[PDB]
Amino acid sequence: INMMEYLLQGSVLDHSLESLIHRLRGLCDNMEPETFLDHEMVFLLKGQQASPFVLRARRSMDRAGAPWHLRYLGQPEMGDKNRHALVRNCVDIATSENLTDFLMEMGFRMDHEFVAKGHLFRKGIMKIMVYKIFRILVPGNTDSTEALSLSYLVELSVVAPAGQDMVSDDMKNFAEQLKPLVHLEKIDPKR
């Protein structure tokens, strides 16, 4: 079958992050944080059609023995079923450790890279992730990193099969539980 992803996004200043972490520890499940660290690449294939194909590939620099991960995300749906979150079509694949060579030989070209570092939380079927984006220059090395801004980014995500109503409502309630600190909205990828 096909799956769908519902998304909500926001940001927080980094001089008040401890209070947000304490609140998320108090609200989420009784599980210790993970502190992930991932490298990310974006591949683009430009054919005859105007819109090029785009794929994302991730890798874990912290835990050895974790397979690579592909991801493809389609255009957001304009249908008026759920109107409080980004609803998109997602396909995710676990792949062996020669992904770049095969993707290059199909015809894809790399576009840009970044490194993300942050924390991860689970609540029911909801995924909270709070991370900071870095910048990679001199693309051969992965130690030439500088911070991009003065704020962390916060994501609320739920992945579920098609249909499956009364999910955005629970996401709205959980977002409103965090209103005095972070303000999460539906925002379009365009500007």
């Binding site: 940001s11 984006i133 910048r135």
Partner: peptide, 24 residues
């Protein structure tokens, strides 16, 4: 009465993680 976020950051980060504006 102290502010604790900054919507222009939100705009920068979202428009830079949803496509590479500011990373190339």
């Amino acid at each position: 009465n102290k502010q604790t976020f900054n919507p222009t950051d939100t705009n920068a980060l979202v428009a830079a993680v949803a496509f590479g504006k500011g990373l190339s």
